[PDB]
Design a protein around this ligand. Sequence first.
Ligand SMILES: [Mg+2]
Ligand SMILES: [Mg+2]
Length: 95
Amino acid sequence: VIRVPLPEGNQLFGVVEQALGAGWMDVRCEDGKIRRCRIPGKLRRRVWIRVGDLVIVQPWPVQSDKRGDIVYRYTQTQVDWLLRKGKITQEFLTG
RNA sequence: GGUCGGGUCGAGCCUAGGCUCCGUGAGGGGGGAGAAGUCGUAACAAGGUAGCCGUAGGGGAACCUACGGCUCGAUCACCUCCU
Ligand SMILES: [Mg+2]
Ligand SMILES: [Mg+2]
């Protein structure tokens, strides 16, 4: 079929609003509470993330409010591919 | 031994008068770390206006300009002074 970063384990879907700075990313998920993603060191080299890139992250059971952590990105050949299956509704990106 | 009178040493207790210690503090100010946030290019080569020191004025910010000094300034010419 296809190998896509679905929610495996406890993953989250990160669609960011603004970069306050130094790696903090305010994310706007379907969950509601303002989460603030940060980044590991394996990908800070070869990839390039910005706004509008729906990507996958991972949250942390501490306070479940401001969490998230990048593990892998999405390429433009998947971001809109993930619409027809309805796995994610894009109206969590226009309001 | 008790009671009244007079002096003498007296800790505490109360008043107001100055000092400092002590945690909680509205609001303000700089310091140090994070370097996939934004604006520029000040320094190092003659860093593209040579850099730096004292004093005063100015500017989003590194910074700019006027007077007096230093070489820890590079290139061409002509002198000058010696080995
Ligand atoms: Mg310059
Ligand atoms: Mg200069």
